[PDB]
Design a protein around this ligand. Structure first.
Ligand code: MOO
Length: 312
């Protein structure tokens, strides 16, 4: 019949290849995908009342915080990624940019940069997390102020334990300084802006940069949300969306679930089995998006038995 998949924008390229593989082994199946920012993909199910067979997110923790237990009973952590600052040969100061000086280039008034909507998209809130965490790493308590506070409607407070809390207003009230910032609904619409030279820099994932042939600044492991060992450092920044939901700096870990209100749950089991199996792993390696092999799952007693063999 019809397989409805809601997935992250960074998952577009591997999910296209996964679709072609799934339709080759299942002839009468039409896989319709809706790519959006992960929080918005989750909000399709939990708030708009839309039904999906597969939900895959760029931040696994959106599943237990927003879906469990009304819309989901389990999740499996399947992939990793890394935040970089992407650019081309047409980008200003691209010859002179590195790990040590990226934010000073971003500080310049003739330099325009891009990130996605933090209310809707993990990459959008991660850009904020990366930028704030840079303050303690580089011993410069004005990086977040110069780049984000002076140019948007976002505000910062400090929690009692020392954690920085970024407040995101309504999406229309973010009101970016057009000279400095291009904002988009999802991270994958800004790729066309970086190609044409409309922006100079772009906070996106390493997998996406490799998918477009972009040059990238390899940001430090302490701030780039890539390494498990730096999880205690990443947790010192939180982002609050307009609806009052709080996301926490953590390593970038992708998560999949089959919702409770899925129409084709039996067929959804097979897609996720393909995803977690050796075929799915290979597709993810090829697109520069490190798979978690074997996949880490919670709520295993609620999982289908076919999928229980593939998880930890
Ligand atoms: O969920 Mo994204 O891959 O941060 O549009």
């Amino acid at each position: 019949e019809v397989l409805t998949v809601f997935h992250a924008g960074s998952l577009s390229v591997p999910f296209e290849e996964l679709e072609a593989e799934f339709e080759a082994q299942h002839p009468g199946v039409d896989v319709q995908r809706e790519a959006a920012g992960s929080a918005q993909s989750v909000r399709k199910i939990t708030e708009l009342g839309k039904k999906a067979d597969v939900l895959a997110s760029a931040d696994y923790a959106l599943i237990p915080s927003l879906m469990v237990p009304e819309y989901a009973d389990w999740y499996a952590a399947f992939a990793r990624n890394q935040m970089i600052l992407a650019y081309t040969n047409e980008s200003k100061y691209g010859d002179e940019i590195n790990t040590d000086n990226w934010y000073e280039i971003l500080r310049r008034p003739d330099v325009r940069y891009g990130f996605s909507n933090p209310n809707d998209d993990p990459a959008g809130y991660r850009s904020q997390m990366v930028t704030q965490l840079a303050e303690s790493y580089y011993n410069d308590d004005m990086i977040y102020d110069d780049l984000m506070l002076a140019n948007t409607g976002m505000t910062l407070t400090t929690e009692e334990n020392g954690t920085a809390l970024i407040h995101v207003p309504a999406s229309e009230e973010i009101s970016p300084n057009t000279s400095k910032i291009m904002l988009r609904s999802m991270e994958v619409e800004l790729s066309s802006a970086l190609e044409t030279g409309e922006i100079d820099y772009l906070y996106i994932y390493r997998s996406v940069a490799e998918q477009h042939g972009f040059e990238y600044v390899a940001l430090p492991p302490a701030i780039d949300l890539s390494s498990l060992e730096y999880a205690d450092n990443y947790s010192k920044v939180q982002v609050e969306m307009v609806n009052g939901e709080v996301v926490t700096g953590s390593p970038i870990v992708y998560g999949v679930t089959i919702p409770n209100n899925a129409e084709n749950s039996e067929l959804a089991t097979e897609f996720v089995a393909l995803l977690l199996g050796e075929t799915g792993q290979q597709i993810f390696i090829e697109n520069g998006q490190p798979p978690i092999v074997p996949a880490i799952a919670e709520g295993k007693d609620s999982m289908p038995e076919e999928l229980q063999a593939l998880v930890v």
